[PDB]
């Protein structure tokens, strides 16, 4: 397919691979997840402006707002983890092995 | 139930009945500290509902006809046999202690349920917060094993964390000499077999373990053998306290609604007393449990739910 869309998809898959190989922190997971959301915003915006499809121009803002609210929820979860262990480490989140 | 979340929606808020007299006061002391009169005296000065000390047959007194059941259905343990042989083979020591912990847990649930359904305070005698002080004093006498202390600490860790501490802990200082004097003057032939060092270890776990950890979570009031005789000085100490510690202060309608829904469900209160941690003093096999249960079902009033027993005179059953 097209070229700049392939670049935005490449960024989406790169932040996906960063979202699928955890190093140390939960904040790194939330950052890779919101980089994915950013690339979804960029690619949706370029499609909607390309076709001159007018009513969908409110769609990326919608795609922003919900997902930003989603990120807020994720941040609050991280905080409660960091109120139990002192760190946001993903290896402290292993009590559900049994 | 009668109280539920819909009653909380329709306006039955349990801080509306929380007044300054709504206090849960636990009177603590040694075996014959003579506090059993004092607590009743507080019940006729502060206007509080006295709950007696939970014996073997507390749950028998709360349910059914209110009479004590035979010992095979309730307890399977005797206080007087613990007075005779504390180092017995079959393990009456930890079995009697665990049944008393469950009975005091039902007493404390009834105490909080009365306090949250009426707004009238409750005077308790030796609540669940002051029960391990016998267990430790049993384990210091070799009457039980370490695995019994582990089982009790498991049950306490999963049961006492759901509740609030009492408002006032009234402790009575009576030394071992006057305790033995009142035991020998009491006249119970089984109770006089209590040794000296057992009472000493009760008083040691009282003074060194119970009261210092109760000092942070509530306010204790400590009395000797003779100044606890006057009820008016005790009531003047209670009323002129300034309640400033403990988790009772950050209690809104939501936390107290959760606690009141917790304590009215008696099987959820008594849930973790019978955890499947297999200890030989409390483990009953399948044949004995089956036989005792089928003998329990044929008791009068115990065959069905309480409003549904034709043998004790329940009418309108076919419309209930």
């Amino acid at each position: 397919m097209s070229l700049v869309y392939m670049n935005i998809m490449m960024a989406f898959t790169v932040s996906l691979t960063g979202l699928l190989m955890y190093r140390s922190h939960l904040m790194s997971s939330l950052l890779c997840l919101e980089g994915m959301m950013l690339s979804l915003f960029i690619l949706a915006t370029l499609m909607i402006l390309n076709s001159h499809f007018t009513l969908a121009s409110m769609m990326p803002i919608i795609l922003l707002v919900f997902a930003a609210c989603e990120a807020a929820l994720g941040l609050s979860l991280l905080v409660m983890v960091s109120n139990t262990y002192g760190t946001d480490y993903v290896q402290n989140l292993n009590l559900l092995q049994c | 139930l009668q109280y539920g979340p819909l009653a909380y929606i329709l306006g039955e808020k349990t801080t509306k009945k929380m007044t300054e007299n709504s206090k849960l006061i636990t009177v603590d002391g040694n075996i014959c500290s003579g506090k059993s009169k004092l607590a009743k005296e507080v019940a006729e000065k502060l206007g509080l509902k006295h709950f007696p000390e939970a014996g073997i047959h507390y749950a028998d007194s709360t349910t059914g006809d209110g009479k004590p059941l035979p010992v095979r259905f309730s307890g399977n343990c005797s206080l007087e046999k613990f007075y005779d042989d504390p180092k017995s083979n079959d393990g009456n020591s930890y079995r009697l202690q665990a049944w008393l912990y469950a009975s005091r847990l039902l007493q404390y649930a009834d105490a909080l349920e009365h306090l949250l359904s009426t707004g009238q305070g409750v005077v308790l005698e030796r609540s669940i917060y002051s029960d391990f002080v016998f267990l430790e004093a049993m384990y210091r006498q070799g009457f039980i094993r370490k695995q019994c202390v582990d089982h009790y600490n498991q049950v306490k860790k999963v049961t006492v964390c759901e509740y609030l501490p009492p408002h006032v802990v009234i402790y009575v200082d009576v030394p071992v000499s006057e305790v033995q004097s009142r035991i020998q003057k009491k006249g119970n032939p089984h109770e006089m077999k209590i040794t000296s060092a057992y009472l000493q270890d009760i008083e040691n776990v009282y003074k060194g373990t119970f009261l210092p950890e109760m000092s942070e979570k509530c306010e204790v009031l400590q009395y000797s053998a003779w100044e606890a005789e006057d009820a008016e000085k005790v009531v003047e100490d209670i009323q002129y306290l300034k309640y400033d510690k403990g988790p009772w202060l950050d209690q809104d309608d939501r936390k107290l609604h959760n606690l009141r829904m917790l304590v009215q469900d008696k099987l959820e209160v008594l849930n973790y007393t019978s955890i499947p941690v297999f200890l030989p003093e409390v483990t009953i096999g399948a044949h004995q449990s089956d036989r005792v249960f089928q003998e329990f079902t044929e008791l009068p009033g115990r065959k069905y739910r309480a409003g549904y027993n034709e043998d004790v005179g329940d009418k309108w059953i076919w419309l209930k």
Partner: protein
């Protein structure tokens, strides 16, 4: 499969054409079995709350039976409607494509040769 049929008139539990079909009788064995399920739910409800199972809550067992029969009557109407729609669409598609459904020439066994396999 038949979701194109319920796409020009959505969310109709019983269409108007379902009224052209006979309803289930009130002595339907399926409906009496659903009433038996209501009686079983009443007995289990009086059993799990430790009530006298046959005696207690006869109004409650009567409402269990009545509620299961009431829902099951309409479920049987919708079942009969959906199998009637299935056969109606089948017969219309058979009638509208004779070239895909030829009449097979039925041969008698005096012409049909079967290889005999002896059993011994």
């Amino acid at each position: 499969m038949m979701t194109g049929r319920q796409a020009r008139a959505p969310l109709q539990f019983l269409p108007d054409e379902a009224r052209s079909l006979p309803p289930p009788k009130l002595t339907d064995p399926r409906l009496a079995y659903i009433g038996f399920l209501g009686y079983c739910s009443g007995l289990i409800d009086n059993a799990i709350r430790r009530r006298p199972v046959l005696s207690a809550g006869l109004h409650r067992q009567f409402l269990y039976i009545t509620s299961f029969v009431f829902v099951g009557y309409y479920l049987l109407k919708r079942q009969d409607y959906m199998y009637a729609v299935r056969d109606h669409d089948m017969f219309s598609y058979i009638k509208s494509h004779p070239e895909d459904f030829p009449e097979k020439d039925k041969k008698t066994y005096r012409e049909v040769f079967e290889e005999f396999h002896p059993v011994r």
